[PDB]
Ligand binder design. Structure first.
Ligand SMILES: N[C@@H](CCC(=O)O)C(=O)O
Ligand SMILES: [Cl-]
Ligand code: NA
Length: 380
């Protein structure tokens, strides 16, 4: 059956390379298998979610060409659906009210006597998790994982006001959206057994899970905002081209023999879960810089010119001063070859737009400065 993957970010306000890699891989797996890639926004923690955060996710995804086939589906807009499933579960006895790990004191069982519910209390609803046996899956990354159901408990699926809880919302979404493959950070591995049990109890087919190892920073710690990570659009703002960041990130957790340089289309054609790395990958800004230099040489000069404009401003060089100065498109072609970033292009090129206080072939340089400008500057 056709593949259906998803990217289901919680919008907490900051996205680094590690985060957007968890979009890249399910996108690539869907495109490789001619399947569907779904976008879901996990906003049920209203305290730690915002519209700004959502637009930044959409902007980073678009910058990297991670187009999605369905969505964005917002969990906070699916509360009627979640409530409907909870009512069905209660009718079928798959969830029960609790009126106080949890020890199942309020779990109904044939033969067991339950107390009368305390008159003053709105119960929480809990899922009837299996008490015997084990929950196991063949993780595409981690291999066979197996957990005793005795170690799990009867998950709260709804608060006393009836609001559904996070893990339950995930399962309903994965069911409703027909998800076949769940590729996500291994920081979610512990939620997997409880999700599997609910999904199965609801009648679904359990997807294939692939839990990605952490991404490390250059200090060998987990890449994170607190550890000084740059944001995805921070890379753009520092002069990195999207095609470079895409090629770099693809290889930060996945391999295909010796290959290091490849297009998006070739990545899609090659991508496979079997060659996801099984241990953490480590960021290396020198490697990213090499690739960015490579792609800068390859980039169209008029494109580079437009990307360069905000870096010239940062150097006290103005739109008007550029139009009046040497042709920027020609300047880009002449100066880009040594640059690791678009910012460096602009810095190396500022000499064409600054009053004189390092140069390519004298003749090309003179041609781009007008006749009038070269003539006068000599005489003095
Ligand atoms: N919302 C989670 C992903 C959950 C999932 O993929 O099941 C995150 O942002 O890390
Ligand atoms: Cl760490
Ligand atoms: Na000009």
């Amino acid at each position: 059956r056709p593949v259906r993957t998803r990217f289901a970010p919680s919008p907490t306000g900051f996205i680094h390379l590690g985060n957007i890699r968890s979009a890249l891989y399910p996108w690539a797996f869907a495109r490789k298998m001619k399947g569907t890639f779904v976008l879901r926004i996990e906003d049920t923690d209203v305290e730690r979610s915002s519209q700004e955060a959502v637009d930044a996710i959409l902007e980073g995804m678009a910058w990297l060409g991670l187009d999605y086939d369905e969505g964005p589906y917002y969990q906070m807009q699916r509360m009627d659906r979640y409530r409907e499933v909870l009512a069905q579960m209660q009718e079928k006895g798959l969830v029960y009210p609790c009126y106080m790990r949890y020890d199942g004191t309020w779990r109904p069982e044939p033969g067991k006597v339950l107390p009368e519910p305390p008159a003053g209390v709105a119960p929480v609803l809990r899922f009837r998790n299996p008490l015997t046996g084990t929950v196991a899956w063949d993780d595409a990354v981690k291999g066979r994982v197996e957990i005793s159901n005795e170690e799990l408990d009867d998950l709260v699926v709804a608060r006393p006001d009836g609001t559904p809880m996070y893990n339950f919302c995930v399962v309903v979404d994965d069911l409703d959206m027909g998800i076949t493959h769940v590729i996500r950070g291994d920081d979610h591995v512990n939620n997997t057994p409880r999700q599997i049990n609910i999904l199965r109890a609801l009648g679904g087919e359990v997807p294939v899970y692939a839990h990605l190892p952490t991404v490390l920073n250059e200090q060998g710690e987990k890449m994170s905002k607190r550890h000084g990570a740059m944001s995805v659009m921070g890379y753009r703002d520092a002069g990195y081209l999207p095609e470079a960041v895409l090629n770099y990130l693809a290889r930060l957790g996945w391999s295909h023999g010796d290959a290091e340089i490849f297009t998006r289309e070739q990545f899609v054609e090659w991508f496979d879960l079997e060659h996801l790395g099984k241990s953490p990958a480590q960021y290396d800004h020198n490697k990213l810089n090499w690739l960015n230099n490579h792609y800068i040489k390859e980039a169209d000069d008029a494109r580079l010119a437009g990307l360069a404009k905000p870096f010239f401003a940062a150097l006290g060089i103005d739109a008007g001063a550029i139009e009046q100065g040497p042709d920027l498109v020609s300047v880009m072609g002449l100066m880009k070859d040594r640059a690791s970033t678009v910012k460096e292009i602009a810095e190396n090129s500022a000499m064409f737009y600054r009053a004189p206080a390092h140069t390519p072939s004298i003749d090309a340089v003179l041609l781009l400065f007008g006749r009038d400008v070269v003539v006068s500057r000599i005489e003095a």
